[PDB]
Amino acid sequence: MKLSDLRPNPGANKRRKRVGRGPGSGHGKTATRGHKGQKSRSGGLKDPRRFEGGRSTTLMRLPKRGMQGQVPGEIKRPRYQGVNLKDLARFEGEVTPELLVRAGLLKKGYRLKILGEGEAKPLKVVAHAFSKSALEKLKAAGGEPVLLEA
Amino acid sequence: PKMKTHKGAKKRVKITASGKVVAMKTGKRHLNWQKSGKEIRQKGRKFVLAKPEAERIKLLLP
Amino acid sequence: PRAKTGVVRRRKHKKILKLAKGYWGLRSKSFRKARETLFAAGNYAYAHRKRRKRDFRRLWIVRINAACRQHGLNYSTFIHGLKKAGIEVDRKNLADLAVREPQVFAELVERAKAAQG
Amino acid sequence: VYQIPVLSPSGRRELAADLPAEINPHLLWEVVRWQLAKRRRGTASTKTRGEVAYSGRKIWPQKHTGRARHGDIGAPIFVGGGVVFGPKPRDYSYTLPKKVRKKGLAMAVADRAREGKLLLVEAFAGVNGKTKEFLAWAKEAGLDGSESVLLVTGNELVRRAARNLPWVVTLAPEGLNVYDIVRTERLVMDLDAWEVFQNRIG
RNA sequence: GCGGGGGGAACCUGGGGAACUGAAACAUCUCAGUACCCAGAGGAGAGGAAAGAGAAAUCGACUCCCUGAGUAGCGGCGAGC
RNA sequence: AGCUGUUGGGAAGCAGCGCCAGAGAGGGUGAAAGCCCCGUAGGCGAAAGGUGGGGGGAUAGGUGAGGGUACCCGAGUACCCCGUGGUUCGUGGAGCCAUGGGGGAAUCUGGGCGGACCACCGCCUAAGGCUAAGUACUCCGGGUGACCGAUAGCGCACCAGUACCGUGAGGGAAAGGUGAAAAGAACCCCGGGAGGGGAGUGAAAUAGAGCCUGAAACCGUGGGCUUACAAGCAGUCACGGCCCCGCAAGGGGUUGUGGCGUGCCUAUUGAAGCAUGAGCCGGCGACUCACGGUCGUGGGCGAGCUUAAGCCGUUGAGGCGGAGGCGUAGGGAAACCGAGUCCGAACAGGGCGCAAACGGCCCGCACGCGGGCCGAAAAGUCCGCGGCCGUGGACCCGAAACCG
RNA sequence: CAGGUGGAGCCUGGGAGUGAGGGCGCGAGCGAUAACGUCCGCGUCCGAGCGCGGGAACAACCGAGACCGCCAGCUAAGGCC
RNA sequence: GGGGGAUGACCCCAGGCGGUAGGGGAGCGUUCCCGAUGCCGAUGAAGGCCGACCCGCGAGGGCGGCUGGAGGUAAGGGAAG
RNA sequence: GAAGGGGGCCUGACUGCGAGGCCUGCAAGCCGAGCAGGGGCGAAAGCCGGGCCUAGUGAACCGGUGGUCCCGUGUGGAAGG
Ligand SMILES: [Mg+2]
Ligand SMILES: [Mg+2]
Ligand SMILES: [Mg+2]
Ligand SMILES: [Mg+2]
Ligand SMILES: [Mg+2]
Ligand SMILES: [Mg+2]
Ligand SMILES: [Mg+2]
Ligand SMILES: [Mg+2]
Ligand SMILES: [Mg+2]
Ligand SMILES: [Mg+2]
Ligand SMILES: [Mg+2]
Ligand SMILES: [Mg+2]
Ligand SMILES: [Mg+2]
Ligand SMILES: [Mg+2]
Ligand SMILES: [Mg+2]
Ligand SMILES: [Mg+2]
Ligand SMILES: [Mg+2]
Ligand SMILES: [Mg+2]
Ligand SMILES: [Mg+2]
Ligand SMILES: [Mg+2]
Ligand SMILES: [Mg+2]
Ligand SMILES: [Mg+2]
Ligand SMILES: [Mg+2]
Ligand SMILES: [Mg+2]
Ligand SMILES: [Mg+2]
Ligand SMILES: [Mg+2]
Ligand SMILES: [Mg+2]
Ligand SMILES: [Mg+2]
Ligand SMILES: [Mg+2]
Ligand SMILES: [Mg+2]
Ligand SMILES: [Mg+2]
Ligand SMILES: [Mg+2]
Ligand SMILES: [Mg+2]
Ligand SMILES: [Mg+2]
Ligand SMILES: [Mg+2]
Ligand SMILES: [Mg+2]
Ligand SMILES: [Mg+2]
Ligand SMILES: [Mg+2]
Ligand SMILES: [Mg+2]
Ligand SMILES: [Mg+2]
Ligand SMILES: [Mg+2]
Ligand SMILES: [Mg+2]
Ligand SMILES: [Mg+2]
Ligand SMILES: [Mg+2]
Ligand SMILES: [Mg+2]
Ligand SMILES: [Mg+2]
Ligand SMILES: [Mg+2]
Ligand SMILES: [Mg+2]
Ligand SMILES: [Mg+2]
Ligand SMILES: [Mg+2]
Ligand SMILES: [Mg+2]
Ligand SMILES: [Mg+2]
Ligand SMILES: [Mg+2]
Ligand SMILES: [Mg+2]
Ligand SMILES: [Mg+2]
Ligand SMILES: [Mg+2]
Ligand SMILES: [Mg+2]
Ligand SMILES: [Mg+2]
Ligand SMILES: [Mg+2]
Ligand SMILES: [Mg+2]
Ligand SMILES: [Mg+2]
Ligand SMILES: [Mg+2]
Ligand SMILES: [Mg+2]
Ligand SMILES: [Mg+2]
Ligand SMILES: [Mg+2]
Ligand SMILES: [Mg+2]
Ligand SMILES: [Mg+2]
Ligand SMILES: [Mg+2]
Ligand SMILES: [Mg+2]
Ligand SMILES: [Mg+2]
Ligand SMILES: [Mg+2]
Ligand SMILES: [Mg+2]
Ligand SMILES: [Mg+2]
Ligand SMILES: [Mg+2]
Ligand SMILES: [Mg+2]
Ligand SMILES: [Mg+2]
Ligand SMILES: [Mg+2]
Ligand SMILES: [Mg+2]
Ligand SMILES: [Mg+2]
Ligand SMILES: [Mg+2]
Ligand SMILES: [Mg+2]
Ligand SMILES: [Mg+2]
Ligand SMILES: [Mg+2]
Ligand SMILES: [Mg+2]
Ligand SMILES: [Mg+2]
Ligand SMILES: [Mg+2]
Ligand SMILES: [Mg+2]
Ligand SMILES: [Mg+2]
Ligand SMILES: [Mg+2]
Ligand SMILES: [Mg+2]
Ligand SMILES: [Mg+2]
Ligand SMILES: [Mg+2]
Ligand SMILES: [Mg+2]
Ligand SMILES: [Mg+2]
Ligand SMILES: [Mg+2]
Ligand SMILES: [Mg+2]
Ligand SMILES: [Mg+2]
Ligand SMILES: [Mg+2]
Ligand SMILES: [Mg+2]
Ligand SMILES: [Mg+2]
Ligand SMILES: [Mg+2]
Ligand SMILES: [Mg+2]
Ligand SMILES: [Mg+2]
Ligand SMILES: [Mg+2]
Ligand SMILES: [Mg+2]
Ligand SMILES: [Mg+2]
Ligand SMILES: [Mg+2]
Ligand SMILES: [Mg+2]
Ligand SMILES: [Mg+2]
Ligand SMILES: [Mg+2]
Ligand SMILES: [Mg+2]
Ligand SMILES: [Mg+2]
Ligand SMILES: [Mg+2]
Ligand SMILES: [Mg+2]
Ligand SMILES: [Mg+2]
Ligand SMILES: [Mg+2]
Ligand SMILES: [Mg+2]
Ligand SMILES: [Mg+2]
Ligand SMILES: [Mg+2]
Ligand SMILES: [Mg+2]
Ligand SMILES: [Mg+2]
Ligand SMILES: [Mg+2]
Ligand SMILES: [Mg+2]
């Protein structure tokens, strides 16, 4: 091609509402802020997703619950991430929780729980936990260990 | 900078996956009350906005 | 990059002051009074256009009613005669007809006097 | 696009290449945008009413002088004051997706190929860098400088030979970029270059 | 005998240390250990070689960037931090 | 590595025939030059002073095993209590680090710590000191700019922190341009000079130094149309006269009479309004940017998408880097279970959740079956653009005041 | 249940502005069967139609919803010495 | 909107087209960048002053004359003091 | 034709829920058949989740008290939730 022929698509660099500026540019004089009082002021208003005009807000009248944590903070307990059967179909191999993260499921500092949705496969499946359903579904076609170490 | 996620929005509500918000119901000191007041007593699906406010107040990620 | 006014505003102003040529005092010489005056000339022009149409017909009417009162009638009746007489061919524009072609007018009077009674 | 002329002393023998059949001129323009953006220096600045020299003193009482009403003279409303909202140093770079750069690289070559403008060459012999020497081989290879040429080779000597030509731009292969392809009427590579170009895409 | 003294744009450590403002009022809270004042250091200053981290039979000084993460928590459990 | 000819005041333009290039960056030269000048690519260079984190060499320092003794292992210290500070920790279950006050130890079987405390199991050895580098900055020098171009850019392009103003701290400006070259106008004339007229210089002198361009408000001379019985937001529509241009038809100017006619902006239920603002003209003047968010939109890839710092590499060359992040499951205060889960005695009910979309070809009785191949779409996610929001001075200007 | 294709209606979302109204008719309250008064209701116009015609002049009364042009026609209100 | 089946910029036909706050849409113009080692330029750049002329609904763009004396910068795209 | 008055047996002034609606800017307020558990009165049909009904009220936060399964900062406890 040629630098003269390049150009973007009809969407794509829309560009741009700025006024300001003319009468019957639309948008002149009050610059769309509409006359007024506070909202049209430079600092504008008070943060609408919260402020209610001085009555007590709609949040903050709801009660709260239950455990919010105390000071040394979050407690250290092993987290599990469930992955499905339907999800792990494509793997013909060993299927270790190690391998699984490499796929783009199983995250990192999470233990493995395979579960539920999908049909099993005659696969070795290494993991930390199995649901009621997934253990069975599996036990029909293939077979699997449970992982505990360290 | 990074938005700050308001704490107690977070302590009073939950965004029910897909897509909206759910709070408890409202009464905490009462003798003569029907025994509904064990009704509700349960969680309440807030109206709207009230949910778009909230929501936008706690983000990244909920 | 910074785009300073430069040449733009002088041009825009010149355009308008040009339009304002001939206007009295400052109204020709000051871009503001020029512009103000012009708003006014603009709406008068528009309004007076619609009304030139009125201004003219009302002249034609006085002229007819004048000429055919020589022949002893109202404009009021004349038009009615001409309405009945089928002669709805108008006029009132032509009316030079009453001035430049008197007899052709007179004939037109008589076609008018005799209609529907 | 597929069938692309090679130049060997042996003969004009021709090569086939994978090279996508549809070019996406938007995608193309997107990489060029990016190329030209990230290279932006972004050095333009101005002083806010805060950063200007003058004092903070209130210029006049604010009632009863009969004059208008003011703060410091650093106020933007004043000739000589701060600038409102004008430019500060900033970084125009963004991160294109890498797959978009691959695609865009591939397509822009493809587009030169599809035109028959792309040529592969073996070994030159217009080496021993001298622009007189190059300008000879160039002629013999059918480049008269009637069309701008992007010369891609890893040979320091040929590169510095072509460099000073008004119609040549010149590149190491690891520096193949789409902007440069599109600017130039004809693409010319040696086979060392075409390799690493192929090893970049995919 | 040897040294000190004073100066230096900003940057640095240490001693001291606000208010407007925010909280749509206001005291805790915020602004903020900011502004500023003082001492001192240098081309940098500080910090530094575990009486550490903190759940793994784990890691190994200190500093700086990215990330962890607006997470854990803190909070007239408010504003906000 | 370049000459000639040509227009021109001037060649670097145009034309002819050449040539260099590791140099076609850029600036000059009477206008537009690779080859006229200064440069550029590529190279070279220190007697003296500085540096010297690199290379080299020296010196300082360093270097064991088993047993036995229980000698030493940082004191107003640890530790406890009171009062406080630091930490995300605002008295909280409040530990840890620090320490103003009181009491006040031990030396490995000693002590501190893992968030009150106790046990157990670990981690570490306080009350002495020093320690490059990776980091911050920019008075200073250099290089670059989708940085400004004399109301801009620093306050200052100019003898500016100056004039000037303030007792003082302190405040704090305006002000750039003849010409290629001064060739900066000899001499004569009017004139006290200033100024001007000739003369002369110049391509040009309304480039003449109060000097490039030279706008507008403003002032003036000359000309045309017009005006002294008309009265009004000053215009407008129509006709007519006089003047100009045009063969003509047509147009430009001006205004006699006629018709119509309540300035602009702002603020208001409502303004010509006897409500706000504006003497007029020029120039300056107000919706931004960063990071988040939320929608839309243009594309890339799609059960995935995508990199951050940084590393390499670069005539304004890109690449690598998978820590991480969003997504792929939800319910539940949590333990926890999981296509479910939560309340519940309940397999009552209910809350919040879960359910591949097309075309078409291989095929199990047939044209869909259903699985499956091929691939238009797409969850999602990435980047760009746009709207809006959050935080920041967040559209601009303005207090009275508060504090150091 | 039918007619009604409309700058109609419903659903999801993005962006607003407004939250000082005024006159008039009708229906009430307050007021004095006062106010260019005040407060509601249902309607309308001005607002934003201080654009046009009528009402001497005149936001809101009568007429009528101004895309542009014409030295053409018919009307509305109100008029025709 | 319906046709015409050119896939529009094009021709028929029917409608709509008062507007403040405000929403939506398309354009014009100024500075800068790529396009440019290019192209326009002393047979005269930008800027200035006239114009009753051409194109555009308009913002604007042309063209001609005068002044000016060294710059300007298409088509197509990017960014904003 | 009881919602009024009298008497007898009784504690449904239950627990777990709750189709579907009234109302309604939100948040609230309201009525509610029906199923399950265990009951009461009744021969049964049946009625019973206070009172003929419409007022007798107070979001959240902070804290008290009783209980329980839930969490317990290396672990068991405990502190505290
Ligand atoms: Mg405008
Ligand atoms: Mg708009
Ligand atoms: Mg508008
Ligand atoms: Mg708005
Ligand atoms: Mg205003
Ligand atoms: Mg407003
Ligand atoms: Mg108001
Ligand atoms: Mg404000
Ligand atoms: Mg209140
Ligand atoms: Mg509660
Ligand atoms: Mg939590
Ligand atoms: Mg409670
Ligand atoms: Mg997150
Ligand atoms: Mg401006
Ligand atoms: Mg008419
Ligand atoms: Mg007739
Ligand atoms: Mg720049
Ligand atoms: Mg200041
Ligand atoms: Mg002050
Ligand atoms: Mg005054
Ligand atoms: Mg300035
Ligand atoms: Mg000193
Ligand atoms: Mg010193
Ligand atoms: Mg300090
Ligand atoms: Mg305060
Ligand atoms: Mg205060
Ligand atoms: Mg306040
Ligand atoms: Mg306030
Ligand atoms: Mg106050
Ligand atoms: Mg603080
Ligand atoms: Mg020193
Ligand atoms: Mg150091
Ligand atoms: Mg030290
Ligand atoms: Mg703080
Ligand atoms: Mg000559
Ligand atoms: Mg020559
Ligand atoms: Mg030329
Ligand atoms: Mg040059
Ligand atoms: Mg040239
Ligand atoms: Mg040159
Ligand atoms: Mg050199
Ligand atoms: Mg001992
Ligand atoms: Mg202790
Ligand atoms: Mg504290
Ligand atoms: Mg503390
Ligand atoms: Mg407290
Ligand atoms: Mg302890
Ligand atoms: Mg200790
Ligand atoms: Mg520890
Ligand atoms: Mg330790
Ligand atoms: Mg020790
Ligand atoms: Mg030590
Ligand atoms: Mg040190
Ligand atoms: Mg410098
Ligand atoms: Mg500029
Ligand atoms: Mg100046
Ligand atoms: Mg200046
Ligand atoms: Mg100037
Ligand atoms: Mg200045
Ligand atoms: Mg003085
Ligand atoms: Mg001469
Ligand atoms: Mg002269
Ligand atoms: Mg001149
Ligand atoms: Mg001149
Ligand atoms: Mg000059
Ligand atoms: Mg001049
Ligand atoms: Mg005169
Ligand atoms: Mg008279
Ligand atoms: Mg007269
Ligand atoms: Mg008079
Ligand atoms: Mg008149
Ligand atoms: Mg205005
Ligand atoms: Mg006002
Ligand atoms: Mg008022
Ligand atoms: Mg008023
Ligand atoms: Mg007046
Ligand atoms: Mg007044
Ligand atoms: Mg006035
Ligand atoms: Mg006022
Ligand atoms: Mg005003
Ligand atoms: Mg002006
Ligand atoms: Mg953004
Ligand atoms: Mg956005
Ligand atoms: Mg996007
Ligand atoms: Mg590099
Ligand atoms: Mg169930
Ligand atoms: Mg369920
Ligand atoms: Mg359900
Ligand atoms: Mg796709
Ligand atoms: Mg996508
Ligand atoms: Mg119907
Ligand atoms: Mg509608
Ligand atoms: Mg909407
Ligand atoms: Mg009101
Ligand atoms: Mg109304
Ligand atoms: Mg009202
Ligand atoms: Mg009546
Ligand atoms: Mg009234
Ligand atoms: Mg009345
Ligand atoms: Mg009304
Ligand atoms: Mg209004
Ligand atoms: Mg009206
Ligand atoms: Mg209306
Ligand atoms: Mg009026
Ligand atoms: Mg009238
Ligand atoms: Mg209309
Ligand atoms: Mg009538
Ligand atoms: Mg039409
Ligand atoms: Mg309109
Ligand atoms: Mg010449
Ligand atoms: Mg320019
Ligand atoms: Mg010109
Ligand atoms: Mg250009
Ligand atoms: Mg501006
Ligand atoms: Mg009884
Ligand atoms: Mg319900
Ligand atoms: Mg029962
Ligand atoms: Mg509170
Ligand atoms: Mg509590
Ligand atoms: Mg339970
Ligand atoms: Mg337990
Ligand atoms: Mg512990
Ligand atoms: Mg424990």
Tab-separated table of N, CA, C and O in Angstrom, chain C residues 81-116:
chain	number	residue	atom	x	y	z
C	81	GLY	N	-68.610	39.134	-9.773
C	81	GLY	CA	-69.046	38.976	-11.148
C	81	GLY	C	-68.065	38.047	-11.823
C	81	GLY	O	-68.434	36.959	-12.275
C	82	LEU	N	-66.797	38.441	-11.792
C	82	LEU	CA	-65.718	37.674	-12.387
C	82	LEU	C	-65.612	36.279	-11.844
C	82	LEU	O	-65.020	35.444	-12.476
C	83	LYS	N	-66.148	36.025	-10.663
C	83	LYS	CA	-66.077	34.681	-10.106
C	83	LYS	C	-67.095	33.814	-10.775
C	83	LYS	O	-66.801	32.677	-11.153
C	84	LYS	N	-68.304	34.366	-10.884
C	84	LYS	CA	-69.447	33.674	-11.467
C	84	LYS	C	-69.183	33.464	-12.940
C	84	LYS	O	-69.329	32.348	-13.470
C	85	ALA	N	-68.729	34.555	-13.563
C	85	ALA	CA	-68.504	34.648	-15.005
C	85	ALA	C	-67.420	33.696	-15.498
C	85	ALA	O	-67.155	33.645	-16.695
C	86	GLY	N	-66.780	32.984	-14.569
C	86	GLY	CA	-65.820	31.936	-14.874
C	86	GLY	C	-64.431	32.497	-15.072
C	86	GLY	O	-63.449	31.765	-15.114
C	87	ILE	N	-64.352	33.820	-15.060
C	87	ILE	CA	-63.202	34.566	-15.539
C	87	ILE	C	-62.122	34.456	-14.497
C	87	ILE	O	-61.194	35.263	-14.488
C	88	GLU	N	-62.268	33.537	-13.540
C	88	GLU	CA	-61.166	33.402	-12.614
C	88	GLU	C	-59.952	33.114	-13.482
C	88	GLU	O	-59.615	31.988	-13.822
C	89	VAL	N	-59.288	34.216	-13.787
C	89	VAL	CA	-57.978	34.285	-14.349
C	89	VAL	C	-57.547	35.543	-13.664
C	89	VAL	O	-58.145	36.613	-13.816
C	90	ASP	N	-56.531	35.429	-12.850
C	90	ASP	CA	-56.250	36.566	-12.033
C	90	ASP	C	-54.817	36.972	-12.277
C	90	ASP	O	-53.893	36.201	-12.033
C	91	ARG	N	-54.590	38.240	-12.603
C	91	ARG	CA	-55.062	39.410	-11.871
C	91	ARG	C	-54.540	39.030	-10.481
C	91	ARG	O	-53.604	38.239	-10.401
C	92	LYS	N	-54.986	39.635	-9.388
C	92	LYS	CA	-55.190	41.074	-9.375
C	92	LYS	C	-53.928	41.748	-9.987
C	92	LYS	O	-53.958	42.910	-10.380
C	93	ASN	N	-52.853	40.960	-10.096
C	93	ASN	CA	-51.538	41.322	-10.622
C	93	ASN	C	-51.598	42.115	-11.868
C	93	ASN	O	-50.802	43.033	-12.027
C	94	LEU	N	-52.505	41.774	-12.769
C	94	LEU	CA	-52.301	42.302	-14.090
C	94	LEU	C	-52.601	43.804	-14.046
C	94	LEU	O	-51.642	44.579	-14.125
C	95	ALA	N	-53.840	44.262	-13.913
C	95	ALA	CA	-54.098	45.605	-13.332
C	95	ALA	C	-53.409	46.755	-14.040
C	95	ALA	O	-53.754	47.906	-13.827
C	96	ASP	N	-52.430	46.427	-14.880
C	96	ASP	CA	-51.874	47.345	-15.852
C	96	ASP	C	-52.917	47.316	-16.924
C	96	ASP	O	-53.136	48.272	-17.661
C	97	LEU	N	-53.580	46.173	-16.957
C	97	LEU	CA	-54.710	45.954	-17.811
C	97	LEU	C	-55.725	47.054	-17.555
C	97	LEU	O	-56.282	47.598	-18.480
C	98	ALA	N	-55.942	47.421	-16.306
C	98	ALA	CA	-56.888	48.481	-16.048
C	98	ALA	C	-56.305	49.798	-16.488
C	98	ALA	O	-57.032	50.699	-16.884
C	99	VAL	N	-54.986	49.904	-16.408
C	99	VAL	CA	-54.286	51.156	-16.701
C	99	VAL	C	-53.900	51.268	-18.171
C	99	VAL	O	-54.281	52.221	-18.852
C	100	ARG	N	-53.096	50.312	-18.631
C	100	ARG	CA	-52.618	50.262	-20.017
C	100	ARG	C	-53.647	49.797	-21.076
C	100	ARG	O	-53.572	50.238	-22.221
C	101	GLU	N	-54.596	48.930	-20.718
C	101	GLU	CA	-55.583	48.438	-21.692
C	101	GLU	C	-57.016	48.730	-21.317
C	101	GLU	O	-57.804	47.798	-21.174
C	102	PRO	N	-57.381	50.008	-21.225
C	102	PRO	CA	-58.661	50.375	-20.614
C	102	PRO	C	-59.868	49.609	-21.159
C	102	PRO	O	-60.676	49.082	-20.382
C	103	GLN	N	-59.965	49.519	-22.478
C	103	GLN	CA	-61.089	48.855	-23.115
C	103	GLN	C	-61.117	47.378	-22.740
C	103	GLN	O	-62.173	46.834	-22.425
C	104	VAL	N	-59.961	46.728	-22.744
C	104	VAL	CA	-59.934	45.323	-22.374
C	104	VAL	C	-60.423	45.188	-20.941
C	104	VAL	O	-61.029	44.179	-20.564
C	105	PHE	N	-60.183	46.220	-20.139
C	105	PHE	CA	-60.710	46.210	-18.786
C	105	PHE	C	-62.215	46.351	-18.842
C	105	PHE	O	-62.937	45.582	-18.196
C	106	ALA	N	-62.670	47.335	-19.620
C	106	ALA	CA	-64.094	47.637	-19.761
C	106	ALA	C	-64.902	46.416	-20.196
C	106	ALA	O	-65.994	46.162	-19.681
C	107	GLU	N	-64.349	45.667	-21.148
C	107	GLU	CA	-64.969	44.435	-21.606
C	107	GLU	C	-65.101	43.518	-20.416
C	107	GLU	O	-66.155	42.921	-20.177
C	108	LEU	N	-64.019	43.441	-19.655
C	108	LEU	CA	-63.966	42.598	-18.479
C	108	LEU	C	-64.988	43.027	-17.436
C	108	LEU	O	-65.557	42.179	-16.741
C	109	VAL	N	-65.224	44.336	-17.336
C	109	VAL	CA	-66.284	44.845	-16.475
C	109	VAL	C	-67.636	44.284	-16.896
C	109	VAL	O	-68.387	43.760	-16.078
C	110	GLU	N	-67.925	44.377	-18.191
C	110	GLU	CA	-69.224	43.990	-18.719
C	110	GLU	C	-69.463	42.487	-18.661
C	110	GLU	O	-70.584	42.055	-18.424
C	111	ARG	N	-68.420	41.693	-18.871
C	111	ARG	CA	-68.539	40.256	-18.669
C	111	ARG	C	-68.871	39.997	-17.212
C	111	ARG	O	-69.469	38.975	-16.862
C	112	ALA	N	-68.417	40.916	-16.361
C	112	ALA	CA	-68.596	40.793	-14.919
C	112	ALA	C	-69.968	41.261	-14.480
C	112	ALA	O	-70.620	40.586	-13.673
C	113	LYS	N	-70.404	42.410	-15.008
C	113	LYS	CA	-71.687	42.975	-14.615
C	113	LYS	C	-72.759	41.971	-14.951
C	113	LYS	O	-73.689	41.759	-14.167
C	114	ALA	N	-72.613	41.304	-16.091
C	114	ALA	CA	-73.592	40.295	-16.402
C	114	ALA	C	-73.030	38.945	-16.029
C	114	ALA	O	-72.290	38.330	-16.783
C	115	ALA	N	-73.411	38.493	-14.845
C	115	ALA	CA	-73.208	37.124	-14.436
C	115	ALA	C	-74.222	36.799	-13.357
C	115	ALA	O	-74.434	37.614	-12.455
C	116	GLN	N	-74.809	35.606	-13.434
C	116	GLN	CA	-75.745	35.107	-12.420
C	116	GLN	C	-76.776	36.153	-11.936
C	116	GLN	O	-77.048	36.266	-10.736
